[PDB]
Amino acid sequence: DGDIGLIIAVKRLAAAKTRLAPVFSAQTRENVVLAMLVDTLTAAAGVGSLRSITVITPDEAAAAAAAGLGADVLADPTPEDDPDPLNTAITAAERVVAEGASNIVVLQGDLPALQTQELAEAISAARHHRRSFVADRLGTGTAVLCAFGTALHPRFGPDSSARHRRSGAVELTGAWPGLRCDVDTPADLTAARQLGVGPATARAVAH
Ligand SMILES: [Mg+2]
Ligand SMILES: [Mg+2]
């Protein structure tokens, strides 16, 4: 059955990963972004403790792709001029997901070298606390946020490591390189490739 309700929030592909503009043309950038979500979902989906994967997004291509892999998809009702769009999409998703699970995990969508075991482990350690989170590879942001029988109160965005620490969420400290190594910039993509990215990403970076 599984007890965890997993959320991924995905912004517009047009807007996404501009720091990858140097190494990739517009359509290739969108594709790589979209395939990183595919590889992230795919590996997430092998985790045994999961009940559901919900993707929330205003982007009909990302909607189609997540739906195609057997995820729930929420249309993102965050407003245009919303000051804090990422954390608002996540809360909008939480509100839904929480009708069907006491324990909720938010996962970033840009973790192409994620391994199933990395996520499972992280979740197994998150259970030992109310609110917990995994930092990103460089330390400053956040790869995953975990809430067991309580509100996520997500503080995603810049210095989300520090802000989550302040929020009182406990820093989980497993190595889990593929979970921590998210991809915003060309050097991130290189680090991820050394860990070994999944098939959608590997194909997409070859065009
Ligand atoms: Mg990222
Ligand atoms: Mg980042």
DSSP 94-110: HHHHTTS-SEEEEE-S-
Contact partners, residue 193, CB within 8 Å, separation at least 6? 113, 205
CA of 143 from ligand 1 middle (Å) equals: 7
Going from the Cα of 86 to the center of ligand 2, the distance in angstroms, rounded, reads: 13
Write out the E strands in 30-141: 50-57, 72-75, 103-107, 131-135
Interval between CA 11 and ligand 2 midpoint (Å): 14
> Can you say which residues are annotated as belonging to the binding site?
142, 157, 160
Q: Alpha-carbon distance 34 to 161, whole Å? A: 25
Chain centre to alpha carbon of residue 57: 12
The vertex-182 CA angle with 102 and 15, nearest 5°, equals 95
Q: What is the resolution of this structure in A?
A: 2.2
